[PDB]
């Protein structure tokens, strides 16, 4: 609750910078890679 | 042609310029959202100066040369002809959706995908809102009437009408009920007309199921009220479209007077002709005579002798309204009057308002009529206009409530619930569409945040508290306490708005966001 | 005093053609967002402060009013294409702009405009030949005159109440427009009516008109119900003894006057009905109900009659019988009589229906649907309307080619193959034209939000092997057989668009050095 929830959401959103940078530098579709990783993580854990 | 000074934009530049224009427009009405909105001083380009917090008027009087902003202005104007109460909310939501679309584009999502995701999110939000609706009519008719009156009073209390808001709400409810079919539940605003005069106070406002005609019954000594004669066949009104003048020869169409002898003889003959006409009128059973033109002095005198009020200078449309209200027919001439064509009204009488010289008359009907006039009084033209706008808002609220018994609670509670549902769906949803759904939920979150900001509450804390209360504790109707309340949970405060109104607001916002998003180039011709 | 050029001079050399190319590319970029059904709209404001938003190519061209002398040629060509053809207006502009872009490096390398024009003409001739080869027109080759349209009709019936029985309804959908004049097809000739009861597969197709039985007066079961070559008489009013419409109030104060009026009315109706016998009409239809006397007279003369025919039903009768409707019975003449090959009364659903069948002059078709519920019949009618529209559009031009860029891909592949066996600059020009031909699918994919690189690579890989019907699928981002999916565009439209684009490109590039006045 309060400002803490907003700051935690912003921190979580910012955490995805590293995978986005890796996808961009690899010549892959930046947005698609993040979605694929998020979808795969729904079944696996620290594997994909 | 007109290549010189011709405006053009690039894709990467236009996609940002449109969003900047949308934000600039949204800043116009951001402060006007909610009952605690701020009054703005506007001067129209035509010189109209007024103070108001209504988003519709603010956008109508405020013109601009930005084509992207003109789209929002036109959308607001078009909505003003439908409900008009969600203009500020619709514009704010559209601006939030456009900002979210800009953020998505910066992340590499094509505009068409963003539009499709926003459409799907709007569909899901509308479905969730409908699922969370409460049916008032199916629960209790007395509670239905109580909620109608409560919403009317809540809408009225934000304007000058607060003095007689109770009577205003009663008049609005009665007007809506009288001009609608219970089963069909379709209400046309054209069936309710707005009228008023400068002077007095709003306490003199009256609801009339007919036409006023703003006439003084010609001669001041004519009867000011005709009764239904203790349960007789109402009051008979003669509808005429010709002046009350004596017949004249067709050779000249004029009467010549040479001296006193001829003057007196012609006057006597004209009096005899007027007596014949009045006898013809009486034989038809008419009590009050209405003519498209004026009356002669002898006609007025003889009608006064016969106690037959005369209405003068009534327009053709006014006569048609009289016929519709009284279910009568228009009689061309006096000699054509018959009992089968005279209109039947409950009563006709003169109503005086202060010292106004109009001395208007009122025609009342007991059965359902297609012409209802809401008369409003006020010490100033601005007061009358504000009262008429409040009446329009109350009529729209009542119309929406009767159209669909399902209702939603205001204060952003519906927006919070829809945002939570859309966020849950986005979390469940896979693919790029998840970002679009999350952006739509964030855009929905703007309305409660703006309401909290306008109400003097910390928006960051308020939005989080509302979301937490509606998510962890239980699903309820908790909104922003814009008005003085002892607690949250509007469900107990009975702050209710029509469900279909909110659905229309969401649909209009989504369509406007798509319209602005789906335009990529703007070309403006030069000037000579 | 008067200066034709307004004191403005122009340079000479490749600079002029390069500037023309730049202007044409600017126009192409301006019109790019509007390509395809999903193309974005453009907000254009006139000098009179009038704002119009639309993706229609013709409207954009009209409101743009290009001032450049060179690009105006392409604008005029596109306007002419729209006026004469009406399809591919934006495609011609896009192709012309792409060709202008491709021509720029050739000009920069010193290639004269004549060589580029000749190469473009040769490539366009090859493309026309390939289009003619790809053009599909099947009459009896692995198909029939109706199967070619029934296949398209079945698509619209997917996931519907008639999906399992689509084989029967597709025939009716095709016949709704094939049996009528193909020069002018419209939705008013495909009226569909509902009859409760019975199975959906038992629906009856009528080449003429059909209507419900509306007679319940004396004389029933006396007039003939079937005819071989009947003559049809159409009337509006003034057929029954007591007119329901356009009548008048009659007041009588004496019994003798009443009897005289009754006798006069009887004589008048007798004469008006004898007119029907004299003209030789077999079926009498009117918008008003028919009384005992008129129906009895018709039965005594072996004449069929039926009243209470609605205005739409009367129009359908007029179209089916090829005759004319008379205002009143007093003017009945044989010139207004129609002819039909069969008249019969149906007993569908235990309810009597009157219809005309087999009339060679019929200009409209009527469908009588059957089913266990009215909602099912309504869904059937909706599916039938969709399929009828699809087959009507297909029949309007039976010469079609695979859509979704498949035709462009095939033309490009063939042009590249020919260029591989052609020496000289002709090879370069043909390759440039073939590459430019791929702009249309590229821009369609871009406007649709698909990944242009991947979709184009997949299309190139698939189209280069096996069938040439592979194209871009817009329902889902992938490559599939458009011909199997019934996605096509007219061959003549493609040929006209290619010719217009080539003409515009040559005209703009035909001049390397020009002295153009300002005005």
From Swiss-Prot, chain A:
The source's domain of life comes to Eukaryota
Subcellular localization: Cytoplasm
Function recorded in the entry: Molecular chaperone; assists the folding of proteins upon ATP hydrolysis. Known to play a role, in vitro, in the folding of actin and tubulin. In yeast may play a role in mitotic spindle formation.
Name the family the entry cites.
Belongs to the TCP-1 chaperonin family.
How does this chain assemble?
Heterooligomeric complex of about 850 to 900 kDa that forms two stacked rings, 12 to 16 nm in diameter.
Q: Please share what else the UniProt entry notes about this protein.
A: Present with 5530 molecules/cell in log phase SD medium.
The identity of this protein, by name, is: T-complex protein 1 subunit delta
From which source organism is this entry? Saccharomyces cerevisiae (strain ATCC 204508 / S288c) (Baker's yeast)
- The organism's lineage? Eukaryota, Fungi, Dikarya, Ascomycota, Saccharomycotina
Included stretch of the parent chain: 433 to 480 of 528
UniProtKB/Swiss-Prot annotation, chain B:
A single GO BP:
protein folding
Q: Name one GO molecular function term.
A: ATP binding
Chief site of localization: cytoplasm
Quick one: a GO cellular component term?
A: chaperonin-containing T-complex
- One matching Pfam family is Cpn60_TCP1
Note whether Chaperone occurs among the keywords: yes
Q: List the subcellular locations.
A: Cytoplasm
Q: List the disulfide bonds.
A: none
Note whether ATP-binding occurs among the keywords.
yes
Q: Kindly give the Gene3D superfamilies that the UniProt entry links to this protein.
A: GroEL, GroEL-like equatorial domain, TCP-1-like chaperonin intermediate domain
Q: Which UniProt keywords apply?
A: ATP-binding, Chaperone, Cytoplasm, Nucleotide-binding
Belongs to which family?
Belongs to the TCP-1 chaperonin family.
Q: How does it assemble?
A: Heterooligomeric complex of about 850 to 900 kDa that forms two stacked rings, 12 to 16 nm in diameter.
Q: What does this protein do?
A: Molecular chaperone; assists the folding of proteins upon ATP hydrolysis. Known to play a role, in vitro, in the folding of actin and tubulin. In yeast may play a role in mitotic spindle formation.
User: Which protein are we looking at?
Assistant: T-complex protein 1 subunit epsilon
Species annotation: Saccharomyces cerevisiae (strain ATCC 204508 / S288c)
Swiss-Prot record, chain C:
Q: What does this protein do?
A: Molecular chaperone; assists the folding of proteins upon ATP hydrolysis. Known to play a role, in vitro, in the folding of actin and tubulin. In yeast may play a role in mitotic spindle formation.
What's a GO cellular component annotated to this UniProt protein?
chaperonin-containing T-complex
What family is this protein classified in? Belongs to the TCP-1 chaperonin family.
Q: Which GO terms describe its molecular function?
A: ATP binding; ATP hydrolysis activity; ATP-dependent protein folding chaperone; unfolded protein binding
Q: Sorted alphabetically, which Pfam families does this protein's record hold?
A: Cpn60_TCP1
User: Which organism does this sequence originate in?
Assistant: Saccharomyces cerevisiae (strain ATCC 204508 / S288c) (Baker's yeast)
Entry keywords, A to Z: ATP-binding, Chaperone, Cytoplasm, Nucleotide-binding
* InterPro entries for this protein: Chap_CCT_eta, Chaperone_TCP-1, Chaperonin_TCP-1_CS, Cpn60/GroEL/TCP-1, GroEL-like_apical_dom_sf, GROEL-like_equatorial_sf, TCP-1-like_intermed_sf, TCP-1_chaperonin
GO BP terms in the entry: chaperone mediated protein folding independent of cofactor; protein folding
PANTHER family linked to this entry = CHAPERONIN
- Top-down, what is the taxonomic lineage of the species of origin? Eukaryota, Fungi, Dikarya, Ascomycota, Saccharomycotina
Q: List, alphabetically, the NCBIfam families matched.
A: chap_CCT_eta (TIGR02345), thermosome_alpha (NF041082), thermosome_beta (NF041083)
- What is the name of this protein? T-complex protein 1 subunit eta
> Where is the protein found, in the record's own terms?
Cytoplasm
Subunit field text? Heterooligomeric complex of about 850 to 900 kDa that forms two stacked rings, 12 to 16 nm in diameter.
Q: Which residues form a coiled coil?
A: none
Q: Which CDD domains match?
A: TCP1_eta (cd03340)
């Amino acid at each position: 609750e309060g400002v803490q929830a907003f700051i935690w959401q912003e921190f979580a959103s910012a955490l995805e910078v590293i995978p986005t940078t890796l996808a961009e530098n690899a010549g892959l579709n930046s947005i698609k890679v993040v979605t694929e990783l998020r979808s795969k993580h729904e079944n696996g854990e620290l594997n994909d | 042609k007109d290549q010189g000074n011709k405006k053009r934009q690039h894709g990467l530049e236009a996609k940002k310029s449109h969003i900047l224009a949308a934000r600039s427009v949204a800043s116009i009405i951001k402060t006007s959202l909610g009952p605690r909105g701020l009054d703005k001083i506007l001067i129209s380009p035509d010189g109209e100066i007024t103070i108001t917090n209504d988003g519709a008027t603010i956008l109508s009087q405020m013109e601009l040369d930005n084509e992207i902003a003109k789209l929002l202005v036109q959308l607001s104007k078009s909505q003003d002809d439908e409900i008009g109460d969600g203009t500020t909310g619709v514009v704010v939501l559209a601006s939030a959706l456009l900002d979210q679309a800009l953020e998505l584009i910066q992340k590499g999502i094509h505009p068409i995908k963003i539009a499709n995701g926003f459409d799907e999110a709007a569909k899901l939000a509308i479905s969730k809102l409908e699922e969370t609706c409460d049916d008032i009519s199916a629960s209790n008719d007395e509670l239905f009437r109580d909620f109608l009156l409560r919403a009317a009073k809540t809408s009225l209390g934000s304007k000058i009408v607060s003095k007689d808001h109770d009577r205003f709400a009663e008049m609005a409810v009665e007007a809506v009920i009288n001009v609608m079919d219970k089963d069909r539940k379709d209400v046309d605003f054209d069936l309710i007309k707005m009228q008023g005069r400068v002077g007095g106070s709003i306490s003199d406002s009256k609801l009339i199921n007919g036409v006023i005609l703003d006439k003084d019954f010609s001669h001041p000594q004519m009867p000011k009220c005709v009764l239904p004669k203790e349960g007789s066949d109402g009051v008979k009104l003669a509808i005429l479209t010709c002046p009350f003048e004596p017949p004249k020869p067709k050779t000249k169409h004029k009467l010549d007077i040479s001296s006193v002898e001829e003057y007196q003889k012609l006057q006597t003959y004209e009096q005899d002709k007027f007596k014949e006409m009045i006898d013809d009128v009486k034989k038809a059973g008419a009590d009050v005579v209405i003519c498209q033109w004026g009356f002669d002095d002898e006609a007025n005198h003889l009608l006064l002798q016969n106690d037959l009020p005369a209405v003068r200078w009534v327009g053709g449309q006014e006569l048609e309204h009289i016929a519709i209200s009284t279910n009568g027919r228009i009689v061309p001439r006096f000699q054509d009057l018959s009992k089968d064509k005279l209109g039947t009204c409950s009563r006709i009488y003169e109503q005086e308002f202060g010292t106004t010289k109009d001395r208007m008359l009122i025609i009342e009907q007991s059965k359902e009529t297609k012409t209802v006039t809401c008369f409003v009084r006020g010490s100033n033209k601005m007061i009358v206009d504000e009262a008429e706008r409040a009446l329009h808002d109350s009529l729209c609220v009542v119309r929406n409530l009767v159209k669909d018994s399902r209702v939603v609670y205001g204060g952003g509670a519906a927006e919070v619930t829809m945002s939570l549902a859309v966020s849950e769906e986005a979390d469940k949803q896979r693919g790029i569409d998840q970002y679009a759904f999350r952006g739509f939920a964030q855009a929905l979150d703007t309305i409660p945040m703006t309401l909290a900001e306008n109400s003097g509450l910390d928006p960051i804390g308020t939005l989080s508290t509302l979301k937490s209360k509606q998510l962890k504790e239980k699903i309820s109707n908790i909104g922003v306490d814009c008005l003085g309340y002892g607690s949250n949970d509007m469900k107990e405060l009975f702050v209710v708005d029509p469900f279909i109104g909110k659905k229309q607001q969401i649909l209009l916002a989504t369509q406007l966001c798509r319209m602005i998003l789906k335009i990529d180039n703007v070309i403006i011709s030069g000037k000579d | 005093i008067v200066v034709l050029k307004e004191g403005t001079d122009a340079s000479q050399g490749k600079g002029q053609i390069i500037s023309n190319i730049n202007a044409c590319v600017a126009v192409q970029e301006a019109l790019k967002p509007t390509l395809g059904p999903l193309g974005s709209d453009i907000l254009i404001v006139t000098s009179n402060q009038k704002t119009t938003i639309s993706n229609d190519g013709a409207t954009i061209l009209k409101l743009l009013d290009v001032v450049h002398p060179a690009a105006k040629t392409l604008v005029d060509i596109s306007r002419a294409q729209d006026a004469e053809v009406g399809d591919g207006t934006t495609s011609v502009t896009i192709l012309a702009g792409e060709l202008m872009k491709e021509a720029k490096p050739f000009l920069e390398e010193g290639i004269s405009s004549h060589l580029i024009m000749k190469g473009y003409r040769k490539a366009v001739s090859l493309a026309v030949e390939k289009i003619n080869e790809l053009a599909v027109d099947i009459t009896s080759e692995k198909s029939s005159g109706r199967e070619l349209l029934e296949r398209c009709a079945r698509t619209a019936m997917s996931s519907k109440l008639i999906h399992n029985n689509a084989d029967f309804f597709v025939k009716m959908c095709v016949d709704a427009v094939l049996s009528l004049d193909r020069n002018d097809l419209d939705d008013k000739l495909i009226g569909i009516k509902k009859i409760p009861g019975g199975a959906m597969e038992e629906s009856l197709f009528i080449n003429g008109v059909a209507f419900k039985k509306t007679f319940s007066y004396a004389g029933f079961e006396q007039q003939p119900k079937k005819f071989n070559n009947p003559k049809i008489l159409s009337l509006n009013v003034e057929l029954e003894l007591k007119a329901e419409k356009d009548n008048a109030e009659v007041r009588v104060e004496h019994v003798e006057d009443y009897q005289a009026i009754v006798d006069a009315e009887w004589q008048l109706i007798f004469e008006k009905l004898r007119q029907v016998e004299e003209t030789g009409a077999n079926i009498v239809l009117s918008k008003l109900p028919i009384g005992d006397l008129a129906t009895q007279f018709f039965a005594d003369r072996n004449i069929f009659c039926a009243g209470r025919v609605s205005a739409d039903d009367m129009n359908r009768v007029i179209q089916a019988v090829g005759g004319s409707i008379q205002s009143t019975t007093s003017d009945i003449k044989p010139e207004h009589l129609g002819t039909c090959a069969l008249f019969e009364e149906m007993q569908i659903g235990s309810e009597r229906y009157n219809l005309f069948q087999g009339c060679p002059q019929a200009k409209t078709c009527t469908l009588l649907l059957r089913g266990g519920a009215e909602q099912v019949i309504a869904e059937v009618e909706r599916s039938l309307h969709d399929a009828i529209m699809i087959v009507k559009r297909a029949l309007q031009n039976k010469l079609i080619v695979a859509g979704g860029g498949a035709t462009e891909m095939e033309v490009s592949k063939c042009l590249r193959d020919y260029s591989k066996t052609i020496a000289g600059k002709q090879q370069m020009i043909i390759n440039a034209f073939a590459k430019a031909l791929e702009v249309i699918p590229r821009q369609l994919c871009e406007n649709a939000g698909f990944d242009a690189i991947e979709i184009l690579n997949k299309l190139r890989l698939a189209h280069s092997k096996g069938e040439k019907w592979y194209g871009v699928v817009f329902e889902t981002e992938n490559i599939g057989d458009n011909f199997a999916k019934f996605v096509w565009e007219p061959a003549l439209v493609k040929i006209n668009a290619l010719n217009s684009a080539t003409e515009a490109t040559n005209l703009i590039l035909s001049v390397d050095e020009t002295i153009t006045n300002k005005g």
